[PDB]
Amino acid sequence: RSDRVAQEIQKEIAVILQREVKDPRIGMVTVSDVEVSSDLSYAKIFVTFLFDHDEMAIEQGMKGLEKASPYIRSLLGKAMRLRIVPEIRFIYDQSLVEGM
């Protein structure tokens, strides 16, 4: 049943990340996927940043995301109305992207 939670979190965390994260060095934070453990206890949030050329900026953005994790879990909780909100971890997705 982790699929429903993962799908819901992807939907909702996308919205939160677009609205709450404002850092010009990384730009829009996009959610590429979400995986949730079978026990619905943990979630992995794969993300990419609009500006990905400065390695130090990417790191600072990933630290900002971890520092902001408790607040982000609180927003998910409100958005999803879950009794137990999974712990969350952010992972930068280095998968191949074309775009154009």
Output the CA–CA distances (angstroms, integers) from residue 28 to 21, 24, 52, in the order listed: 8, 8, 11
**In the chain, what are the domains?**
1-100 (3.30.300.20)
- Structure tokens given for 3: 């699929």
Please give the method by which this entry was determined. Answer: X-ray
Among 61, 41, 36, smallest CA distance to 51 is for 61
Angle at 79 between CA 74 and CA 85, to 5 degrees: 50
- Structure tokens given for 31: 């959610």
Resolution in Å, one decimal, please.
Answer: 1.7
